Design a protein around this ligand. Structure first.
Ligand SMILES: [Mg+2]
Ligand SMILES: [Mg+2]
Ligand SMILES: [Mg+2]
Ligand SMILES: [Mg+2]
Ligand SMILES: [Mg+2]
Lengths: 389, 389, 389, 389, 389
C-alpha cells in the first residue's frame, strides 16, 4: 500500500527560555493525535521534542501537502499553545504560529514540514531526525555525505544496486529557484551550491535508478511576516534506509563528525551539531523526551529515532545515537563548543552580518560618527586630540 | 550429573535495519522456552540479543547435536519470524532461516550453535558470549589469549593445575579439515593458522590434563545456499571457567584489548570489537536486552553473561563487561572506530576482495574497458588524448 | 628623538607554491637595506618571513607615509622579484606588486604597511607581528583583547595609568569610512563592528590618556586591480608595550587562544591562527626565517619578534612564542585544524560566498538549469522521471 | 622547454638491518650524479632516503623510459652496493638489484621508477614523496583524495579550472591490465578497484581538461625472479602542483590522516603511514637524510620534499611535513601503531595469506595432521583421548 | 672470521650525584681505547653512557672472558677514576671498582660484562643496550618477549627459520644455579622463574636450530664485598639480529611497553623503563652521550645503539629509539612515573624488604618497642593510656 510519512514540527513554547519543552505539551499532543487516529484521520503517530522544538510524526494515506494532515498539526500546536504554553506563561508561547488562520497548507506559516509518500516496502525502515538551535542547511553536510560520499556510505562503491547514485533537489531559498543535481557526475557543482548552507538547501533526495524518494528535509523559501523571516526555523528530516538506499548505519555515520552549523545562541553563531540521546523513549505512550539546550542555548543538537513501518503503523521509535561509539562524538562536540566559545562575538563563531537572526548594527551606525576615509587621513591628529581633550 | 549447555543463535529480524531486535521477539522466545521447560524438554534457558542477533541459551540432558534441542530452537526462530518479524515487517525478517524444513540438525541451516556436554562440577561457572557484526574468527584472538597467552592468563604460569596447557580444535572452513594443536609446544603453528581468521577458526578447546571441554565457538564449514555463504554468520561462544580452566577474570582479560575484527558494515570492513554492557538483564524473566549497533552498523560488539549451573539450572546471567575498567576499553574502541572510518573504502579498513560479503566488482569489470598493459604503454598518448577530446 | 617604525610586507614569490620563501630572497633584501642604512636612508632594519610573506621592518626619521621609505621597500621587492623569484620561477613571483610604476605611496599597490611615529621612550619595547594565510581582521580579536578585555590585560584593572582605556580607529574597508571608538564606554558598539572581521578592521589604536600611538595594523580600503581585490592581503602589525600600554606579556596573552580566522587554503576557509616559532633568528645578519605552511596551505600562523629601540636602532628580534606554554596553544591549534578540515567545502569552514577569494559559482550557475520554485512543485514528478529515464 | 623529472629508488643496504641507510651511501650517490651533471647527462639531482630506501631524483631532457637515465641510476646503485654496502657488510646489501646485467630499462629489475615529462610551466612546483615499509598501493588513498575528494581538495569545487576532474591510470598488477577512469563520473568504480591496494594501483594521473600529466606513482606488474616477487617494493611518487592541479597544501592534506597501509615488519602487516620530517636537508650538497624505522621495523613512514623547477634546475628540497600541525598527525600515528601492535599475528594487523611477503604455512601444513571434518566429528572423543593419553 | 663483541660497563663517577657522567670521562676512555686499537689489542670500540654508567663496547678476536680485554677495561676505568673522577671530586668516584688489584677476570669486581663470540655473518647487525638505575632482571621481560612472545616477534610464527625457538640460559643469582629452558615448550616454566626478576635472570640466549649465540645480558651471582652486594649493578645487553634471529625492529618492539623495573632512587623502588634517545652520537669520535637521570634519580632509562660489523669493525652506532613512535612510549613512561611516585614509600612502588638496596629497618627495630601480640591484647587500654598521659 502507499503510505505518507509526515513530520510537522514547531516551537510553541519553552521551559525555561529555549532550553526544553514542558512535558505536558507532549502529553497533550499525543492525546490529541490518539483521537485523530481513533477517527481514522491518521494511521499512527509519535510525538517528541529536541530542545524546545516539538515534532509530530504521523503516518496516513492522504498524500503530501494534505490540508487535513497540515490542519490537524496546526490545531494540535494551537491547542498546546492555548491550553499549556499560555497557561504556564512558557517562553515564546505560540512562537512559530505566525498567522491567525489556517489557509490549507502549514508551509510558510512558521512550522516545518518534511514528508514523503511511497509504496511501503517488504521492510520499510525509516529514521526521523530533529535538530534544535540550527537551520535546515545544517543537514546539508550529512545528506551529502550519506548519499554521495563514498567515505561515509560504503554501498556507493560495494553495492551494485547504489552504483547509479542519487538526485538532489536543492532549493535556493533567497531567489526561490530549484536545482536538480545528480551524483556522482554533478558532485562538485552540487557542493558549490550546498556549501552555502544558509541559501542553498537540500530539500529532497531521490534514488536515480527508479526515482524512489529517499529523504525529505524541512525547508521553505524565505518570506517576511511581522518582524520575522520564516523558512529556516530548526529543521526535521526523514530518511528511508536499506535495499538500494543507504543502510541505517551509513545514514548515522553521516552524523558521526559533529560539524559546525549556524544557529545556537540568538540564531547568530556557529557551533558543533552534537548527536544526542533522548532522555526517555516510551513506544507505548508514543512519546520521547529529547535533550535540553544549556550553555549558550545549545550547543545545537540532533536526535534520531528509527522506526519500522507495517501497513503504516510505526513500530519504534529507537534512539539511534545511543551507543558508546557516539559518546566519543559527543565528547568532541563538547570540547569544540568550549574552544569556539572563547571567540565571543567575532566571526566565524558569530555569523556573517547578512546571516544574523539578531542585530544591533542599526542602533550602532545611528550613534557612531563616520568620517570619510580620505578626509580622515588629513585630519587624524585633530580628530584624536579632540577625542583626548 | 552430566549436563549439556547449548547456545543457539540467529538473526531473524532487525529493528530498525540491523541496529537491534524488537523486544517482543525476546519475550516470545522466552515464553516459548518456558513451555518447553514445563514439558521437560530442557532444564533452564536465558534469552538475549546483542545487536540484531538473538541467542537462546538452554541447558538440558539430551547431549550435543540433539534433534529435539536443535528443533526446539528452529521452531522458536520460525515462530518469532512468523508472529513478530513478518507481522512488523522487520528488516531481514527470517534472514538466518535458510531452508524450508528442519532436517534433524540446525548446523548449516543458518543459525549458529555452540554447545558442550560435561559432568557438572562442584561449582560450574560458565560465560556465554555473543558478538554482532562479525565472524566466528573474531574470537580467535581472545580464545588464543585466554588459553595460551601467559600475559593474559596468569594461571598458565602460576597455577600447577594449568601447566600442561590446552588442545585446540581448529576448523578450516574452506577445505573442511580439522587440526588439533596443543599449547604450549604448538603455539607458533597454531598462530600460523588462526591468524587467518576468515579461514581457520578455533571451534573447541579442551583441557590437556584430562580432555575436559573448556570452550565451544560457533562455526561451520562454508556452504552455498541461494546467493548466500553460510558458516561465518555472527558467532556465539561458551567458556567454562576456574579450577584448572582460566578464571572468569582471565577469560574477560582476553577481551580487554578491543582488537580489529572482520564484519561491521555490509560484512565487508574491519573495526574494533567493543566489549559492551547489556541495556538490561532480568534474571527472573530470563531475558537480557543487549546493545544497539549505530554508526556504520556497529562498531562490532561482544556481550558477556556469566552463570553458575546447579543441576542444570542457570543462576544469572551477570553482565561481566559492567565495570569502569571496561569503560576505558570502550573509549579506546570508540576512538579507533572513528580513526579507521576515515579510511572509507580502502583496505585494510575494507576487507580483502575474497573476504568481502558485498561486491560490485562484477558490475565494474563489465563497464570499464581493460587494456593489455603491453600494448597500453605504446599507445598511452593516444588513449589519453582520446579520453580528453 | 622622534622615530618612525615601519613594516612593509609583500608576498613576491613562494617556495614551493605558497609554503615558504626562498632564503636568498631574505638575504638579498637584507643586503639591500644594509646599503640603504649605509647611505642614511634608514637607521636600522630586520628582514623576516612567516610563510611566503616577507616583512621589511625599518626604523628611520622620515615620518609615516614617506615616499622614500615606501619607495625603498617597493624597489627592494621589485629587485627580489627580478633577481631571485623570476630567476628561480618561484610560485606567484611578484604576486603582490600590482602596478608597473611607484606613485609616491606603496599603500593600495599590493604590499601591506603598518607604521607609527612617536617620541622614543626611556625604554621603547615594541613587538612586530606577521600572519600568513589570513586577512587583517584576523588581528581584530587579539587587538580588542590586549587593549580592552580585562580577562587578557590585567593592567586595565590594576594599573592606574591604563584606567582611562584606548581609542580604536576602525576602517570600514567596503564603504571607506573611519570610526573612532573609545573603550571601556564604547566596547559593545566597537564589537558590533569589528566582529565582522572582513569589513570593519582595527587599523590603529591610541592611548586615551594622551593620544600616544599604541598599535598599527596593516589594512587598506578595498580596490579592484586586474582580476584582484587589494586591501586585505596577509597582515603585519606593530604594537608598543609597557608603561601605560599593555605589558609585552598582555600583548602575547591576546594570542594565547588560537581563534578561527578567515584565509587558509585559496583565501576561502576558516581555521585556527597558530602562534608559531621562527625556524631561526639571526640578530647579527638582521634575518629571521619564519614557519612553513603545510596542510591545506596552513593552518594560518602568526609570528612575533620583540625589539628594544635605542636612538632608532633595533636590538632583537626575540621570538616571543618560543615557550612550552605556547606549545599547548599550538597543540590546540593543530587539533582544531584537523577537526574543522573534516567539514570539507561547507560553511562555516568554507567562507560566506561574498567573502570568498575563489569561486566557481559563475561556472555552476551557467551549467545547472534552475526551475522557478512555484512551477517546480506542480511538475516535480515529471522533472524527476525525466532525470531518471 | 620540455623537462623530464625522474625518481629512481632502491634499497641496496641497511644500517642496521632495515632501520636506515649509511650516510656514505648518499654522499657517494650524490658525487656520482654530480659527475653525470658535469658531463651533461642530467641537468640536476637530489639524493635522499626514507628508512633504508634511497631515492635518486634527477631532472634531464631525455624523456621517460630512457636507457641512459635508467642506466645511470643502475650504475649508481651498483657502485654504492660494491663500494659501500658490501664493504661495510650492510644488511640486504644490493637487495633490490635483481639481475646481473642492465637490459635498457630499470623497471622490473628491482628499483622503482616514477617519472613524468612535460613543458616546464611559468612556475613549476613539484613534490617528491618516498615511503618506506609499504607497497605502492599505500599511495592509492592519498592520490584519490588529492585528485578526487572534495573534502581534501577544495579546488575541485571552488576553482573553475579543476571542475572537469582527472584521469586515473590504474594498473592491475596481477593480470597486467590497465584501466582508465575519470572523476567525478567514475569515482565509485575507481574506488571499487583501488580499494584493493595490493592489486589495483594508481600509476599515473592526468588532468582531464588538457591531458597534462599530474602525478606518477612507481608500480610494475608482478613478476617472479629467484624466490622473489617484484613490482610492489616501497614506492616513490611525483606530483605537480598549482594552476589547475591541486595546490601544494591540498596535496599534503591528502596525507593528513595517517591511514593503515600494508607492509611494516616482514612486508606482512598493516600499520599507519606516518608523515615524517627529514633529519636534515642540505640543498647545497643535494642530500636529505630521512627518518629511521624503529619499532617493529616502522611504523611505515612517508617523507615529502617540495621543489621549484627552473630550466630543469631543482631549487629545494623543502621538507613539507615540518609543521606543528603535522605533529598531531604523527602523534595519532604513534598511538595507532601501539594500539594495533597489541593484535600480534592476527588479521587484519597481519595481512591476508595471499598478500603476505613471509610465510611458514608450507612448513606448518607439513607437520600438522589434518582430519577430514566429516570423519572427525564421528571420532572426536577418540582423537582427544589419543592426544591426552 | 670469528669475532668477539664485549661490552664492559661501570659507574666510576657521576656529575652531579648520579644524574649523568662528566664528558671528559668518555673522551679519556675513547683516547685510551684508540691506543689499544693502534697496538692491535682490539679491532674497534665505541664509548657511551646512559645516566652515570659508562659502557666500553669493544670488538676483538681474543674470545670471551679474556684477561687482556677485561684488564684493558679495568685499567681504562681505573685511569678515568684517577685522572678525571677524583680530580673533579665526582660523586661515587670509582664506585664500581671494588678490589684494589685485577685478578684475571673483571666479573665479580663491580663492572658488568656482556660478551659473545661468533662467526661474523655475511651481514652482522647487532644492538647494544645500556640501562641506568635498574638491575639486570630489567631485561628479563624484553628478552623473553623478543625471543618467545609471538605478539612481539612475528618471525616466530611467519618465518620458517625461527619456528624451532630459542634456548635461554637463566642464572639463579642467589643459589648460583643455571637453568636451560627452551621455548616454545618450556615457556611457562621459564616465566615461572624469570618473573622473579631479582633472582632468576636471563644471562644468554641461543638459537635452538644450531646453538648460535643470540644475546648476552650482564649478570653475576650475588657476592658480598665491603658493605656491598655485587652482581645486579645496572646492566648492559648485546643482541644479534636478523636471519633466523629477531629482526632489529622485533628486538626494539620488545621495549615498546615501558614496563615497571626495580631500581630508580636508592636502588629501592619500581618505576617505568623509559626507552630514551642519546643527546648526541659521534660515529667519528666513537662517542655517544646518553640521557640524564633527573626526577627521583630517573625514571630508569634504556638506550639502544645499532651497529653493522665488518671484519670486526663497528660501523655505527645508530640511536634506535629515535623515532616519533617512541615519543609516545616516553610520554607513557613520564606519566606512569608521575602516577607511581604519588605512592611515596609504600610497596609496590618501594621494593620488597629483601630486595631493597637501602634500609633503616635495623635502626627502627632498635628504637621501637615491640609487644608480644598476645599479651598486648589484654593490656591495650593500659598501653594507650600510657602513651597518652
Ligand atoms: Mg528551537
Ligand atoms: Mg547480526
Ligand atoms: Mg601569504
Ligand atoms: Mg625499504
Ligand atoms: Mg648507574
Amino acid at each position: 500500500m502507499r503510505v505518507t510519512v509526515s513530520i510537522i514540527k514547531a516551537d510553541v513554547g519553552g521551559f525555561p527560555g529555549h532550553a526544553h519543552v514542558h512535558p505536558k505539551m507532549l502529553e497533550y499532543a499525543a492525546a490529541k493525535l490518539k483521537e485523530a487516529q481513533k477517527r481514522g484521520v491518521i494511521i499512527d503517530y509519535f510525538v517528541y521534542n529536541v530542545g524546545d522544538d516539538i515534532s509530530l510524526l504521523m503516518t496516513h494515506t492522504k498524500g503530501e501537502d494534505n490540508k487535513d494532515i497540515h490542519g490537524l498539526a496546526w490545531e494540535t500546536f494551537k491547542e498546546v499553545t492555548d491550553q499549556i504554553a499560555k497557561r504556564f506563561k512558557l517562553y515564546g508561547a505560540g512562537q512559530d504560529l505566525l498567522k491567525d488562520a489556517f489557509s490549507g497548507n502549514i508551509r510558510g506559516m512558521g512550522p516545518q514540514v518534511a514528508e514523503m509518500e511511497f509504496e511501503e516496502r517488504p521492510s520499510e525502515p525509516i529514521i526521523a531526525f530533529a535538530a534544535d538551535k540550527t537551520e535546515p542547511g545544517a543537514f546539508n553536510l550529512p545528506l551529502y555525505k550519506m548519499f554521495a560520499d563514498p567515505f561515509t556510505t560504503a554501498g556507493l562503491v560495494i553495492d551494485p544496486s547504489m552504483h547509479e547514485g542519487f538526485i538532489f533537489e536543492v532549493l535556493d531559498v533567497v531567489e526561490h529557484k530549484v536545482y536538480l543535481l545528480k551524483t556522482p557526475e554533478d558532485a562538485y557543482s552540487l557542493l558549490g551550491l550546498i556549501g552555502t548552507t544558509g541559501r542553498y538547501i537540500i530539500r529532497k533526495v531521490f534514488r536515480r535508478a527508479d526515482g524512489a524518494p529517499a529523504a525529505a528535509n524541512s525547508v521553505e523559501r524565505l518570506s517576511l511576516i511581522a518582524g520575522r523571516y520564516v523558512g529556516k526555523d530548526d529543521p526535521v528530516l526523514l530518511v528511508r534506509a536499506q535495499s538500494g538506499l543507504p543502510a541505517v548505519g551509513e545514514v548515522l555515520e553521516a552524523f558521526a563528525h559533529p560539524h559546525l552549523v549556524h544557529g545556537w545562541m540568538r540564531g547568530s553563531h556557529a557551533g558543533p551539531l552534537m548527536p544526542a540521546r533522548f532522555i526517555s523513549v516510551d513506544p507505548e505512550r508514543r512519546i520521547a523526551i529529547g535533550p535540553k539546550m544549556t550553555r549558550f542555548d545549545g550547543p545545537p543538537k540532533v536526535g534520531a529515532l528509527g522506526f519500522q513501518l507495517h501497513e503504516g503503523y510505526l513500530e519504534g521509535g529507537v534512539d539511534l545515537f545511543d551507543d558508546p561509539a557516539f559518546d566519543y562524538v559527543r565528547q568532541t562536540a563538547a570540547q569544540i563548543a568550549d574552544y569556539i566559545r572563547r571567540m565571543g562575538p567575532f566571526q566565524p563563531h558569530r555569523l556573517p552580518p547578512e546571516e544574523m537572526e539578531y542585530t544591533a548594527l542599526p542602533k550602532i551606525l545611528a550613534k557612531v560618527k563616520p568620517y570619510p576615509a580620505d578626509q580622515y587621513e588629513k585630519d587624524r591628529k585633530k580628530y584624536i586630540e579632540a577625542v583626548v581633550k
